Amino acid sequence: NGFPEVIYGAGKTATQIVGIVQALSQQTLPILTTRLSAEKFAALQPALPTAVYHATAQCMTVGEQPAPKTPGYIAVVTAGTSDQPVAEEAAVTAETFGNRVERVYDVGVAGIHRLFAKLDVIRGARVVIVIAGMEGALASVVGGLVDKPVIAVPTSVGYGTSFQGMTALLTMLNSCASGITVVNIDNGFGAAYSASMVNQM
Amino acid sequence: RRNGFPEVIYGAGKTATQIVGIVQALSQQTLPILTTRLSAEKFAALQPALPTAVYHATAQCMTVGEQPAPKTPGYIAVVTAGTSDQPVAEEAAVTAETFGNRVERVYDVGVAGIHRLFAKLDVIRGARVVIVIAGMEGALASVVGGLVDKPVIAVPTSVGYGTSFQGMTALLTMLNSCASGITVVNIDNGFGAAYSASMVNQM
Amino acid sequence: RRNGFPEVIYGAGKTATQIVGIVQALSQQTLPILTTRLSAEKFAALQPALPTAVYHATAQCMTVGEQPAPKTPGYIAVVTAGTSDQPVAEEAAVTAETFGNRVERVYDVGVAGIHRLFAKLDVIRGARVVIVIAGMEGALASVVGGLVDKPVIAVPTSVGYGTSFQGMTALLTMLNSCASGITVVNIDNGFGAAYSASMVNQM
Amino acid sequence: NGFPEVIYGAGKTATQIVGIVQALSQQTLPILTTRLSAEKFAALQPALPTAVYHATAQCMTVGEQPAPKTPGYIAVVTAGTSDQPVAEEAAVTAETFGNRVERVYDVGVAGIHRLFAKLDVIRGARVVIVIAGMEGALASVVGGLVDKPVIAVPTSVGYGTSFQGMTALLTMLNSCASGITVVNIDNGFGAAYSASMVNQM
Amino acid sequence: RRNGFPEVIYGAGKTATQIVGIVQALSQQTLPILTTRLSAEKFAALQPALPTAVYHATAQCMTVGEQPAPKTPGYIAVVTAGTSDQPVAEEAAVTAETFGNRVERVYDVGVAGIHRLFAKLDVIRGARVVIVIAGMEGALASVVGGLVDKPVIAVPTSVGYGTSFQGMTALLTMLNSCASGITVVNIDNGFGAAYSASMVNQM
Amino acid sequence: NGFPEVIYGAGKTATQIVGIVQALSQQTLPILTTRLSAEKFAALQPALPTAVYHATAQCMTVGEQPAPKTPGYIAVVTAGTSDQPVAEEAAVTAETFGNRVERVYDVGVAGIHRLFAKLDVIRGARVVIVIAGMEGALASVVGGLVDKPVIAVPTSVGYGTSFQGMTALLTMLNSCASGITVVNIDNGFGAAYSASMVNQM
Amino acid sequence: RRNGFPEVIYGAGKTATQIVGIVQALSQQTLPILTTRLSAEKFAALQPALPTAVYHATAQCMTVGEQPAPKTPGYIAVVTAGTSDQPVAEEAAVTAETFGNRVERVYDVGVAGIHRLFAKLDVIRGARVVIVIAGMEGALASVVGGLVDKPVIAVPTSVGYGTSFQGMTALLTMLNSCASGITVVNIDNGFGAAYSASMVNQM
Amino acid sequence: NGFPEVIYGAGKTATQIVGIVQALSQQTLPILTTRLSAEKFAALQPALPTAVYHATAQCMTVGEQPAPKTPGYIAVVTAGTSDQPVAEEAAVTAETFGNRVERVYDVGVAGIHRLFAKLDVIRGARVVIVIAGMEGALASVVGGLVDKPVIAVPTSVGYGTSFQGMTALLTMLNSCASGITVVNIDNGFGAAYSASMVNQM
Ligand SMILES: [Mg+2]
Ligand SMILES: [Mg+2]
Ligand SMILES: [Mg+2]
Ligand SMILES: [Mg+2]
Questions:
Q1: What are the chain B neighbours of A111 within 8 Å (beta carbons)?
Q2: Is the C or the N end of chain B the one with fewer CB within 10 Å?
Q3: What is the DSSP string of chain A?
């Protein structure tokens, strides 16, 4: 089929992932765990010593770390430092599928000059992924400045009236006619999954 | 006591003769009066009743009276995202001028083509205050906010396609951009924005 | 710089003569232009002004210009749930073809009668991308998503009975289906979906 | 009357259920406890040793476990493993009322072939109960494929934009013209109650 | 394979001739067909096209075909809160009868005057199923639910004053009443309620 | 003026109420504390030994318990046992203001016969106060059966789709033409305050 | 049994002849009847049918019958925020008078110019009950509530600009003001407010 | 530039603020920390002993406390004592930027006479800042009584139907034609930032 396996680390218990990981990882393409608790990564180190963990990403993969299967790369960009978790969740997921990924972090619209410094890197990426929370303006900015496919991920980070990310989700929908397609809140996985399919062309 | 304010009438709540009954009752102070949000038909039956009255179709407002020079040399900037927001922006611009301010309009400056914003950034930054008006693309307030170090009044507009929610999303996004002096007002309320912007300009 | 894109005009924001003032001003590049979401009356007063223009009533769009061969041999699939979503789907299909793509339409493929989906599954799966369009029954994006291993752009539609919320529920359900490459766009935004789908098809 | 008794395990205190269970279970049809805390099942074992507990269902019944009062059975189907709690809450409630119930678990639309494998069992059930959370598509699928009464239960399980189950509740309402009638979020009890009445015909 | 169901057409999505093109194409099975939610003008241009067709203005539905005896001796009860819910209730009643059920209507049984409910409680309780229909006063489903030990399908209606939210509150209240067999359907969906109620009546 | 004093027990700290209670209760009409924590009632017993506490009401009054200043009484009615807290919050507040109050508890619409048993008491009360949460039908029922002023209080108690009491608030508004006026969620104080004014006529 | 209440008909739910069929059927008790929320056209076709009927255009209500003296000497106060709330307030005032109460109207008492409230505060405070009616500026209920020690029934109105949400925000703000006897009713429900206010006035 | 630096105390970790404070406070205008945890103010005292902390404001500034750079002052007014936190958050932020600020606290509409006692002070302030939560009526009152620029801040404080401050945000928007411009919930920083710009004219 070509796609690795993926589970639901937050939806399952501390060991149901490992009870089915051995029934699902019978020497096949590497495994992926999304939404894994920072504490539950320690309660499973003795069960799988050959496991790597990404604290910022809250994801863990046990197996092969593939190589670039395409000369083009995906660009993950984020406005503030508060969205770095869901950014790395998308980054390591786009890495498991076998796509080189370039990280462009802390590039909010409050400092728009920071984007034009890294615009040459963003424009030369087969797909780009915009991440935002409070006032998801970054999507509209990169959408009108980059004529390449963009995936938008809203984040639940923020305080009052952000509505746990709902008001960023509505922003990036309202600027979709610029080449932007948006997925669900905190769904860095679904963005990198779709971005991988577009990059694997 | 009056502190130098022109008179304002809500043109949508009154009938075609109730507003001319309040204009001719105020036609003695020599200070210009203003009427907001009145339809083109609400004025068409008035042109014979008020020969000394001028109407702005795009702004949907009417002002009648001798309008003297601006009270302050500073100018406020009315920034618009797309062509579909020209009504509300002109509603704010024509009412901002009536209170006695100079106003430099900066229209069609959406994020779709940000270079248009950097073209007129010098005019926007050198203004006492800036009023941002945007609809489906509520991002414009965030961009201008972080690029100007002067007060900003954001005004969402109801024009948009689906999920624009008659400008409700534009309201939330402008609210979540209160970083570098962003301040939002009600939906479509170009007047109240220019009301607050006139006091800041004439501090 | 232009990278090979046809021209697009928002037909709902302009008047009947403002769009023919922009068509004849662009009638020199020989590259076809497009106009989205213009009413049948907004075109009826134009047929004498543009003899070389064709209109799609179901799509509510107008394209004028010599349309050459497709730029890529791949084809995108426009999948529709019910007969009531034919407008938006055709809006996406006719604009997806203008950018220079082949498109194989797959209509009336609702979950009410899933066998109709398994009938044309071979055509849908062998396409470079797939655009799903659904209204009250937002489930179609979820089913096609888990059944095709190609990118999918979901487009909710406003048509529906009560609680459909002008397609708002269809938006939420398509958003909660981002498993196997599902990606949603704005309500009724068949154009923006096909805009993104054209770049993925011509990577 | 024919119906057993039922209480509100989460709405009452640790012993108000037992203070009224003896005033209400004076040797009558078996008793039922909905929404009972996993901890409070241990603080009441000494008070009623003849009590059975279902951890997955979070329900406990003290008395007779009846037999099938009708040759037909009710089918409880669920899309993912995250809805198994409210599924078993409905399953054991349909069992107390005296209806045989067939469980068809982990049958999401992401793997639609899993449903057609068990479709012969679902189609031959006097009533079926669909359970879903994220993108409640399963209801519409079974509704258009099974010409038998369907009850729909939305679940609060899920992350962003699921709105604690609200966005599944709206989905199954919008496909009611296919023989689907939907109840409240996490209300596995009300679904099995109605499904029992339909089965007891 | 068909299991004994009459044919149904969504009269709101089609044009005045598209539904008569589907009626005459089905005028060979001798099994009656049904059309829901078609306007009185959508039928007025049809009376010459279908002499063997009967229309129910209050129900906004049309049925054409030889309608035989009921399939089961049991009867379902259609309970209505106020006079303003007669349209949707009759939409459910006329479609519930077409599938081959007897139906005993119980109208104007609002909580404002609960004695009217206790008057016809004997008729309601002795029915195989009961369909409750209510608008601003969504409480009726809760009262009947706790008073009958038979399945109940609740149907909210969009009619109401402010805060009724086109029947959205009626939907929530009927949802929070799932105690004694209450089960809610979509807004105004009298058909789908009667569709489910026909299968329960003919178990 | 005639009205006792009232504070905000949940909005203030453990002793700001007592720091201002002595500046506000300089030998005047009795004092009232709304929304007081069950734990904070113990951290203040040494500061005011002449204080009475109502655990169910989560309110405490320090001073005179007045007598009926009017021969008529207010009736507080509640559908289920889960609304008894906010019911007693209204009951003891209507008692401080000097109105006799009759309690009619556990009278849901699921057992409508329980209401007609106590309808003779409800109908003879100058004001009545309906309390409800899940499916606030009780208000509409008593409103159409009692031609006397009714105050409606929605409660935050309930599970899914109750929206922390929001969906009961909308119900009792939609049946206001029957002599019903509704206040805020869990605002038993504001109901008894208004009911007192109507009774003190 | 009737306890002294006039008759009330929902004028919006019935047709132009159904309400005159209920008026002439009640034209024998000599007790006046009332009809709420009927349009000016719904009465224009009635003036010949009921010569002994009077209509209130601002209130959109019609009352027919010999109206005797007030039942109690106390008076209720109907307080209005702006000129745009005169319809609903008059709907409450004319129905409050029909039940047999004196009512002292206090109009145009918005927070924009609070001195107008302190001018007529003596009249408002000395009333048995007070009904507050406000739209976009829902603050008026909070101000009057803390300034009068008599029961208050708040009534939000649907009139407003953006974000007023057809008076939904006015409903929330009046709900969050339940401090000194504030009690809110449904949107635009001036009748139900006056229904409750008549029982409190005649305790 | 003229503006001091500001961080996000709640969005960062216990020391990321200090890891970048020394890279950002290389002997420049004073530093500002918004939304700082009451506990995290103690875990950083050994790292910066020359730091002052405002418990009510939940903000801490390390450096110069400037002097009035303009003879006019900003007025922060609040209705109840429950909004004093976000009030002091705005007060100390307007103080860092170099504006004298006058505090007018506990001035709700329930006691409107308290406002007219301090109205002479409010009217003589180049900018005023209204703070409110439950029934944000105070903004409309001061807006119609003060012909000077007003900034409105809604607070998340309150109970039922306040919707974590959402229903105050909608109130002050609906009275913007009186010279009122409103910012986000609990955003005392953004209000004082804008109020400073207006005062620095
Ligand atoms: Mg682009
Ligand atoms: Mg079916
Ligand atoms: Mg009554
Ligand atoms: Mg002012």
A1: 146
A2: N
A3: ----EEEETTTS-TTHHHHHHHHH-SS-SPEEEES--TTTTTSSTTT-SS-EEETTTTEEEES-----SSS--EEEEESSGGGHHHHHHHHHHHHHTT--EEEE-S--GGGTHHHHHSHHHHHTSSEEEEEE-TT-HHHHHHHHH--S-EEEEE----STTSGGGHHHHHHHHTT-TTTEEE--TT-HHHHHHHHHHHH--
